[PDB]
Design an enzyme around this catalytic site. Structure first.
Site, PDB file in Angstrom:
ATOM      1  N   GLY A  10      13.633   6.410  -5.307  1.00 49.01           N
ATOM      2  CA  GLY A  10      13.752   7.050  -4.008  1.00 49.01           C
ATOM      3  C   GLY A  10      12.597   7.971  -3.740  1.00 49.01           C
ATOM      4  N   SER A  59      11.214   2.653 -10.249  1.00 49.69           N
ATOM      5  CA  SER A  59      10.356   3.494  -9.381  1.00 49.69           C
ATOM      6  C   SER A  59      10.463   4.950  -9.832  1.00 49.69           C
ATOM      7  CB  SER A  59      10.753   3.260  -7.935  1.00 49.69           C
ATOM      8  OG  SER A  59      10.681   1.857  -7.692  1.00 49.69           O
ATOM      9  N   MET A  60      10.786   5.877  -8.942  1.00 47.69           N
ATOM     10  CA  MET A  60      10.860   7.285  -9.362  1.00 47.69           C
ATOM     11  C   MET A  60      11.933   7.482 -10.443  1.00 47.69           C
ATOM     12  SD  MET A  60       8.847   9.738  -8.634  1.00 47.69           S
ATOM     13  CE  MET A  60       8.790  11.480  -8.912  1.00 47.69           C
TER      14      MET A  60
END
Ligand SMILES: C[C@H]1C(=O)N(Cc2cccc3ccccc23)C[C@@H]2N(C(=O)NCc3ccc(F)cc3)CCC(=O)N21
Ligand SMILES: C[C@H]1C(=O)N(Cc2cccc3ccccc23)C[C@@H]2N(C(=O)NCc3ccc(F)cc3)CCC(=O)N21
Ligand SMILES: C[C@H]1C(=O)N(Cc2cccc3ccccc23)C[C@@H]2N(C(=O)NCc3ccc(F)cc3)CCC(=O)N21
Ligand SMILES: C[C@H]1C(=O)N(Cc2cccc3ccccc23)C[C@@H]2N(C(=O)NCc3ccc(F)cc3)CCC(=O)N21
Ligand SMILES: C[C@H]1C(=O)N(Cc2cccc3ccccc23)C[C@@H]2N(C(=O)NCc3ccc(F)cc3)CCC(=O)N21
Ligand SMILES: C[C@H]1C(=O)N(Cc2cccc3ccccc23)C[C@@H]2N(C(=O)NCc3ccc(F)cc3)CCC(=O)N21
Ligand SMILES: C[C@H]1C(=O)N(Cc2cccc3ccccc23)C[C@@H]2N(C(=O)NCc3ccc(F)cc3)CCC(=O)N21
Ligand SMILES: C[C@H]1C(=O)N(Cc2cccc3ccccc23)C[C@@H]2N(C(=O)NCc3ccc(F)cc3)CCC(=O)N21
Ligand SMILES: C[C@H]1C(=O)N(Cc2cccc3ccccc23)C[C@@H]2N(C(=O)NCc3ccc(F)cc3)CCC(=O)N21
Ligand SMILES: C[C@H]1C(=O)N(Cc2cccc3ccccc23)C[C@@H]2N(C(=O)NCc3ccc(F)cc3)CCC(=O)N21
Lengths: 182, 185, 182, 182, 186, 185, 182, 182, 182
Positions: free
Chosen positions: F61, F90-91
């Site tokens: 996100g 991802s993050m």
């Protein structure tokens, strides 16, 4: 939903071993009823349970979660139709303990074949059709066992929507008695 | 769509004057009715001269495709088929339905074959009727495709279970077309 | 829609006494077909007319506008099913001149009971139900006359969707001949 | 959801080491089940846990959160299919302690290949395809270990939706026993 | 769209250009646009099999199969098809610009040429996604092989240079081998 | 969400927080970050020496919301163990790699995915330039920290995050995103 | 749109070598204007063409299709701003034949930097940004050549929306003369 | 729209030098009216043109395209308000040839300040505000010249919607005469 | 949101004089923060308060409700940027007690001019423009006072979005220190 003193009214009925099946049958409703049945068996394995049915039916697999839990547990589960039992709701009405399936006099019972759908490739439609036909055979076999009617008669009588009065449902073998008022 | 003056014609009407019919869209009843009318008109103008059916189509309605198929087989002129761009599903069925020896694709055209698609909602017995109908339709398509390709029904059944993309040369090897129309140097 | 030289292709076919019923039957389609039939009778009261049918059916009253105009006019109206004739389309296929009802070999014919709907008061639903049942009796009586099948057989065979091949439609009496290619 | 005296019915079942997997599997459901598993291990590392499964499946990674937590903890996790276990739900049914995987007699089990999607550039679609193919290889390898069926058999049998009865699921090795009613 | 009258015949402006053997590819390429352009190419070959045709390209591209309908018709017919980029040729539009007769592929000086890999999608079962992926990869191999033949660049270089959106000026498109000449104003 | 009662009623996640377990189980937005930052600061105040356990099952996100969590982890005194269960993308994978050295884990069938940041820019040419420079500087910041925490070069991280890159738990250990695969007894 | 006798009014103006750029510039408008320019060159290679501009601008590539076609053809193309010329419309006004760029006295001219957007990965946003910056450098260099202003001044004066009167546009070098009424 | 013999009725009026401004003023309407004015000047540079106005107004720049074309051409353009002239329509009514501006007796004239919008950064809102204020100054200066009213009076009288009868519009100097019926 | 034992986690932080500004600033957020500041002043008028900022900004008047409450109360309000402070969030970061304004090392600070909008009559647009310009002057004057930068520099540096690292925000005077980890 009112409170009595503290229980919400449905939780107060559950304290007296009454379970309410009062909505369309989906997985959430089935999971709740299954949990209530297992809890009541643990509280007292001998005392009857009362399943109130006012339902238009719904999911066949969710209905079989309730059906199999009723047959699994030790206590007798009485069924009582008030208002209406249709489709999988009428199947569950017929699934109550032998001699302890009831309707009130103006309750409506309806039986019919299962509904569904299929979209896609011809072979996917064939798989979906085979599955819903096998599901109908499974429902009809159990309904034949619980009513005393032949599978051939159940097949004919469920081809289209078939509405029964409480007295007709007793004659059919879906219930044992009409609970007539004093 | 541009106009040409010879008589003023839209470009598709000008091609129809030279016995070329364009099947260039999804096959629905409107497209089928137009192509059927064009075939019957061209037969009346000249019952002996070939007709050229251009196919660039993703397919569509099986019954609309059979309106075209049966009209092709009914009329006296040979109907050549040529795939340019793509022929998929009922479009590839119609490509295979051209006059024997006169089914073509240009070299970079895509041909795709697969089983028919449909759906049904309602009572168990209604779903059974719909399933039996689509299975019978697939048997009908596969039988004709076997006759026009020379492949067995069993092979066509296996090869259409999922989307099967063919090059022009692969479609010739399969028997869906007779020749790849290679460009002159 | 292409032009031939100047006519659009459908107007060119009408010059050769061919009428296209190639869409769902609604009042606009019926009004057009009725007008074409009356025009062709005026041009030549003796020469056959050819009604091409590739239709999934549609409005029963619009279909009866076409049916009654066919029976009214003096020329024979041949019917030919190419692609599909379903529901009111199959009724119109069966309505062609005796001996001049055809299908091409891979054309699909489907017969079934009429569809409709009603919402409102019980008495309004009763009026709508009586109307669609009388419409079904009217369709079945005419189909019995044109096929040679009994009304009882037509009632049974149209209870659900019934798909026929061109050869099955000939055996049933909905068409006279399968037009086999040279 | 009723209350018993105070617990909501599901919280009362968790007090008796019963966890409900009764919905589509998404990250929220997985996080809750993982937390319940870790809490029950902390209360008693030796006593069995009971995982009820009535689920149409869902996210493969959310399902693997549950799978790896079951294998990590010390207590045996019994699995019981009531109603239906489909897709990742049937994978989790097969993941229960060896000898303690059950279904009730009318429960439905369905197995099929994973579903997903890819949009974008050719190389993005290639990455997405390779990922879903590797995910299917991982699922099939574990299901082979848990059922005793070969990876080749699992691949063929899950190409399309494959519905099993409870007895067929026992024959397949997805469960150990059908829990028949007294 | 304006009308012109030549003495007398009335033409919409695009029909008047077609009378002088100019075909306009001025929109996204879909099957309708391809069918029209294919018909125009076949008509112009029949009118004169020797005289050049001029294909104007101001297009953001579109359907690869619709683009190959146009490409194969260009290669099939006898006349040379000149291509001229005015405004922009992107994606399958730049592929068609490169497909003109050798020595007769042009751009005007401020035209934009963009090359990139094909786009698509797939949703469904793992095996359906695999079929879709294999198809788009084979399509990209086919595009790159033809672009290598028409530009003189290696397939390896074309693969690298189309991984992401690659904008070229007209002069850069000439250096690449996508066109032969920038048409500089007199 | 079920409740547990000890002879004190807790929702199940609040009961895990009593044992110093924080759940990052959703997409990372500012609300999720604010909650996790508050939990970290509360746990430090309760016990500045005892480990904290950050469970990660997240598709990632917001990068700034993820840096709120990252900087709070580095600020506080207790070690924050990270454990990937289900997926870290991802993050979420960046935060997995940010756990205390030697105390970053994944369970064997967990998925780790790494890729470059996503964003958008609309407006005048100069506004698009500002937005592009910002997302490129953000990517360089992420890559520099990931290089520090994995031992891989910035150039290798840049290449390996150009497109979505899925790693098994064992591959994530080999890469340096985690220290150990937590294998079951 | 009225007819004069037969031409629609815009087609009648095209007979007198007047082209109307009277809408937002998109590819359809550019294709039409390019075709009109090429046709007018073929009709008469020597006589001036008149491009009327009442446009808020639009697509930069569509505007460059028009710009390059103007520079390609042999006839001089006069430009006249009536109403408004903004953004790519003011660029095209400045692109008319030297000495033959006009505005009527109450026409509005607006100049500003190009607009666009990008969504996706950081590397995709970088490609989009580099492209719009190169496009702006190309526009500003041509406007510097056609106005006589420095590139540095054009960059400053287009940073935000800059509205000019007809007289200000003449002083700037975007037009040669204000066409004052008799 | 009826045809007279062949012209649509508006094209027939244009043959007698009557132009209809009968809708909201947008660029399409302005481009059409400008083309008609230029065509009529070319047919006869001396004969009056008649501009019918029944318009609620619209775009100020589109209105200035019409205004400047009227002042540019050699023929006098009479204006006649029938129904209503509001906002930029009343500005164009006042722009007709001196002594040849008319209204019919029950026509409505409305004057008010220009409308617009601004969104964005403070400095963008400032640019938009300065532009609409300068536009209002331009409109008021011209209306002062054409009516004989002061700029200060026009500013005050257009602060809010100001409805005028035909006789009031004559007194104001927006028209020269009320065209009274025989 | 988890509970600690009973407080929700944010209420537990407020017990230790920590206020969370963790969302877009609207009137609801401002009213809550104002109430928290007034409550903490009452609980202890001397002890520091800690304002956490992770905010993209929002309403300027809502931000000034917070700003003026911070300056009104007796306790020092420390500000700490974690994640991001943009627009009115960066204004509030700069408003903390002198020497007690912090950012964590990877926090993002962004400064830019105020945004707004206006639609309606020219005079309404002028009022809206003058209001947003006066608001920008008020913000810039306070930011000059709190950073030590000139109003001219602040105006230039906020014309467009200006992203600062924590270290750059310290160099600018928006914070006093980067809070580096031990
Ligand atoms: C008569 C018999 C039975 O058929 N039911 C089924 C039933 C269920 C729901 C609604 C019904 C409405 C009308 C008629 C029966 C209904 C439950 C009832 N029970 C009681 O009434 N128990 C006292 C009780 C009720 C509610 C409560 F809150 C506390 C005590 C349990 C003991 C028992 O034999 N019965
Ligand atoms: C029979 C065995 C088992 O297979 N289950 C699984 C199960 C789960 C959910 C619904 C089910 C419905 C039908 C059949 C099994 C069901 C749980 C059960 N348990 C109990 O019934 N424990 C008393 C209990 C239940 C609920 C409650 F609230 C308090 C006590 C725990 C101890 C045990 O051996 N079992
Ligand atoms: C064979 C026979 C018939 O059954 N039809 C029905 C029919 C209708 C629509 C499509 C059909 C497709 C395939 C097969 C029959 C089709 C029409 C036909 N007619 C012609 O073909 N007439 C020349 C003609 C046709 C079109 C045209 F434009 C000019 C002339 C009229 C004379 C006649 O006996 N027939
Ligand atoms: C029989 C009688 C009549 O009742 N109608 C009404 C009528 C209207 C519309 C559809 C109908 C369909 C079926 C039956 C009647 C229909 C019109 C008809 N007319 C004609 O048929 N005139 C030749 C004609 C028709 C059409 C055409 F195009 C050219 C000539 C006018 C002269 C006349 O007495 N009649
Ligand atoms: C094994 C180790 C660890 O890696 N975790 C991380 C973790 C977090 C979330 C889900 C996980 C699922 C599977 C595997 C690890 C999981 C937490 C765990 N803790 C406990 O299990 N503590 C008892 C406990 C848990 C829950 C509860 F409610 C009460 C006590 C704290 C003490 C400790 O060392 N650990
Ligand atoms: C080569 C052969 C053929 O395969 N076709 C099929 C075809 C159809 C549509 C597009 C095609 C594109 C590329 C290649 C074939 C295409 C038609 C063609 N015909 C012509 O080209 N006829 C002159 C002609 C065409 C158009 C026109 F307007 C006037 C004359 C009829 C005579 C003939 O043998 N052929
Ligand atoms: C270090 C200093 C400070 O800068 N903050 C600001 C702050 C706010 C929000 C999140 C942050 C994350 C990382 C870094 C600072 C953060 C609060 C902190 N306070 C505490 O940590 N107090 C114990 C405490 C915290 C939470 C809780 F629930 C109980 C006690 C108050 C006493 C103090 O000096 N500080
Ligand atoms: C210069 C050359 C060429 O490259 N083109 C391509 C072209 C196509 C579309 C727009 C263009 C705009 C700018 C520049 C080239 C454009 C067509 C042109 N042709 C003509 O101009 N032919 C007279 C003509 C044109 C239009 C018309 F309606 C009548 C005649 C055919 C003869 C020829 O050699 N050429
Ligand atoms: C004055 C000069 C010029 O600047 N224009 C540009 C122009 C374009 C559109 C609208 C305009 C409105 C106001 C002022 C100029 C306008 C065109 C005009 N032309 C004519 O007026 N030609 C007769 C003509 C016009 C239209 C028509 F239908 C027939 C003839 C061509 C010859 C020429 O020198 N000019
Ligand atoms: C200063 C004076 C006043 O003007 N207000 C109004 C006020 C209202 C809301 C927000 C404000 C923010 C900034 C400044 C004034 C604000 C209330 C305040 N009061 C207190 O502060 N009372 C202690 C108190 C407050 C909150 C709390 F929870 C407990 C005690 C009551 C006694 C009194 O004279 N005052």
């Amino acid at each position: 939903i009112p409170t009595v003193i503290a229980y919400d009214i449905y939780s107060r009925l559950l304290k007296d071993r009454i379970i309410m099946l009062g909505s369309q049958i989906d997985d959430n409703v089935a999971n709740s009823i299954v949990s209530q049945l297992l809890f009541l068996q643990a509280q007292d394995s001998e005392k009857d349970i009362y399943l109130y049915i006012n339902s238009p039916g719904g999911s066949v697999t969710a209905g079989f979660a309730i059906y199999d839990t009723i047959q699994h547990i030790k206590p007798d589960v009485q069924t009582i139709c008030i208002g209406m039992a249709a489709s999988m709701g009428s199947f569950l009405l017929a699934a109550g303990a032998k001699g302890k399936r009831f309707a009130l006099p103006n309750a409506e019972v309806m039986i019919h074949q299962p509904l569904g759908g299929a979209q896609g490739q011809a072979t996917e439609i064939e798989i979906a059709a085979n599955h819903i036909l096998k599901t109908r055979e499974k429902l009809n076999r159990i309904l034949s066992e619980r009513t005393g009617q032949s599978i051939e008669k159940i097949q004919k009588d469920t081809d289209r929507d078939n509405f029964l009065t409480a007295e007709e449902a007793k004659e059919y073998g879906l219930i044992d008695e009409v609970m007539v008022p004093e």
